[PDB]
Design a protein around this ligand. Structure first.
Ligand SMILES: NC(=O)c1ccc[n+]([C@@H]2O[C@H](COP(=O)([O-])OP(=O)(O)OC[C@H]3O[C@@H](n4cnc5c(N)ncnc54)[C@H](O)[C@@H]3O)[C@@H](O)[C@H]2O)c1
Ligand SMILES: NC(=O)c1ccc[n+]([C@@H]2O[C@H](COP(=O)([O-])OP(=O)(O)OC[C@H]3O[C@@H](n4cnc5c(N)ncnc54)[C@H](O)[C@@H]3O)[C@@H](O)[C@H]2O)c1
Ligand SMILES: CC(=O)N[C@H]1[C@@H](OP(=O)(O)OP(=O)(O)OC[C@H]2O[C@@H](n3ccc(=O)[nH]c3=O)[C@H](O)[C@@H]2O)O[C@H](CO)[C@@H](O)[C@@H]1O
Ligand SMILES: CC(=O)N[C@H]1[C@@H](OP(=O)(O)OP(=O)(O)OC[C@H]2O[C@@H](n3ccc(=O)[nH]c3=O)[C@H](O)[C@@H]2O)O[C@H](CO)[C@@H](O)[C@@H]1O
Lengths: 307, 308
């Protein structure tokens, strides 16, 4: 059995690639290496096949899909801010690739696709509340609108052409191989890289902001279950733990792990920042086997010891 | 004299809007690919009218078309939902990419005001059988409906990020002269009226108890012009329905009586996707626009019938 993983050379995708190969799958990666890196992949694993190109390219997707039993669709420009700066270009990666994938899967008779949607589809709705999947949508950026549009098209292909989409709205994923080089990189990747290097961090605001952080290995387990479940539900599932971690908690946790004090410069609160973000993960608990997820401290330590 | 760009200006709603803007003294530039639009719909001969034949998703064309324009009405789209079910890839260019490319061209040119033809389709089946308020949860079921809603989201992004002034209008069921009846999925009033004028049978799909919130095109045109001229239009969407209730059976009787001739009604099965009850909550419309006295169904059907 062969799994196509678009965006398989990236942060989440490469961890998924490792897990699928360890389970005995043949794995085909489609990645344009815009942010993905070949160093993330087990090149030389005989079960792994790398295709380099644009997931929005119809002819290449027809090749990439042939001989595949299922698909995990992770390819997108992950930076929300890149979509603000270039709506036209990012719309190709963040929506057209989904549409093209629907067409290629339908023509080839492949049903199961696991899709990386995003908590950004909610906008600021549900600030301060456990965010359920029926929370009203308010996508504020091209990236968020394209993720939600991808959801709606995937649902149309389900009803009209028999597709089996597994729609997952990721909350704040973290772990090894997450790039900390951009200012808008995940806060954990940035704080961890600075703490390892003994360099100061900048806290934007008072640090009371809370996020529902998910360690990448726990998300990977969900992704694999999405591929293997017999009859997945038709509607979206939040991927969060319902956890509440303040940034000040995160700073203290890293300081304890690094064994050295973290110098904390004070920045203003980011414009448009959501203060309190937490998933209601009832659907996740009901539809998937969550086992015992990594605690924040366990995830931070696995990340920090990998740097 | 100010100039209004009207994408889709050669179509059913667009050409009536063009007539109205010209009568008010505006200059008008139409951008239309003549896919379903028609040059015969336009007063080719009004000195204030310019016609550009081309694709509204064409960025080079839009960069030319916005030059010297003071505001826009964005009506271009493949109107038929069924066409988007058959060809999602092609219709996405017309139903969403055209909006995105217009936002880019308007921002570069400094033009703020754009009136956008959204659609009741963004609600799907949510709120069926109730007056649908604009904050009803969305459920676009086809590529057309998803593309109209995505257009709303991008328009709101360009508002907050680049100072665009979108007037988002969710049309319910618009009818009137020039609505093309040549498709089996043309609007039911354009189809029924064409058959009645010809003395030929109509086909009723279902029991005829389905209800729609019909709007005569001249009343929508009044709203479109006000959207162009309002000082500080609201950022959120406004339904364009009257909150009225017309069954298909109401329409059959009303049209038969207007025609003065017998009307044969053949049967067909309910269409698989068919929503039975569709009505707008009109409160935001009544707050934000001056509706005056809208045309009743009978007055609209009569004006339609008298034109053929
Ligand atoms: N990390 C998070 O917290 C988070 C949150 C919500 C959603 N997501 C979604 O999860 C998925 C994985 O993101 P990630 O965190 O691993 O970031 P990432 O940038 O490491 O992974 C994105 C991958 O997609 C590839 N890619 C981008 N555009 C492409 C294109 N046009 N064609 C082919 N490949 C292309 C990139 O090269 C990269 O390998 C993305 O869709 C992202 O939007 C992530
Ligand atoms: N009941 C209704 O009439 C109704 C309901 C909801 C929404 N709308 C929206 O109102 C607008 C007008 O629809 P209409 O009823 O007048 O039908 P219409 O087909 O007569 O008008 C659509 C026009 O857009 C033009 N067009 C299509 N694709 C184009 C492209 N790629 N580039 C340039 N021009 C293009 C067509 O040539 C036509 O003139 C559309 O956006 C439609 O989706 C209409
Ligand atoms: C998805 O966005 P989301 O805000 O959820 O996630 P991010 O990782 O980008 O940021 C989380 C929080 O940490 C803050 N933050 C981020 C980076 C940094 O160097 N310092 C800092 O204080 C952010 O402003 C935000 O309040
Ligand atoms: C013209 C138009 O925009 N139609 C769309 C509109 O349908 P919508 O149902 O709103 O409008 P229509 O004018 O197409 O049809 C109204 C009713 O009349 C019926 N009828 C129609 C034709 C006929 O010859 N006999 C008859 O009885 C239809 O089945 C329907 O029940 O929203 C639906 C949901 O997005 C789309 O699927 C339709 O394509």
């Amino acid at each position: 059995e062969r799994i196509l993983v678009t965006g398989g050379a990236g942060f989440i995708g490469s961890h998924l690639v490792d897990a699928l190969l360890a389970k005995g799958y043949a794995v085909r990666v489609l990645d344009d290496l815009s942010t993905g890196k070949v160093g993330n992949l087990p090149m030389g694993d005989a079960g792994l096949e790398l295709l380099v190109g644009d997931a929005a390219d119809a002819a290449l997707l027809a090749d990439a899909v042939q001989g595949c039993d299922a698909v995990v669709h992770l390819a997108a420009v992950a930076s929300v801010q890149a979509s603000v700066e270039d709506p036209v270009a990012t719309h190709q990666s963040n929506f057209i690739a989904t549409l093209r994938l629907c067409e290629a899967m339908t023509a080839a008779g492949i049903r199961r696709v696991v899709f990386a949607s995003a908590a950004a589809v909610y906008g600021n709705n549900g600030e301060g509340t456990p965010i359920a999947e029926d929370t009203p949508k308010s996508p504020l950026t091209p990236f968020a609108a394209d993720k939600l549009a991808s959801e709606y098209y995937l649902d149309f292909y389900r009803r009209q052409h028999g597709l089996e989409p597994v729609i997952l709205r990721f909350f704040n994923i973290f772990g090894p191989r997450q790039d900390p080089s951009s200012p808008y990189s995940g806060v954990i990747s940035i704080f961890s890289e600075r703490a390892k290097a003994g360099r100061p961090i900048t806290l934007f605001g008072d640090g009371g902001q809370t996020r529902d952080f998910v360690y990448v290995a726990d998300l990977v387990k969900i992704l694999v279950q999405g591929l293997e479940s017999p009859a997945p539900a038709a509607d979206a599932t939040n991927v969060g733990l319902g956890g509440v971690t303040t940034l000040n908690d995160l700073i203290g946790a890293l300081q304890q792990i690094s064994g050295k004090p973290l110098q904390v410069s004070h920045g203003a609160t980011r414009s448009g920042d959501i203060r309190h973000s937490k998933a209601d993960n009832r659907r996740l608990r009901e539809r998937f086997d969550l086992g015992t997820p990594s605690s924040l401290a366990e995830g931070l330590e696995r990340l920090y010891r990998s740097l």
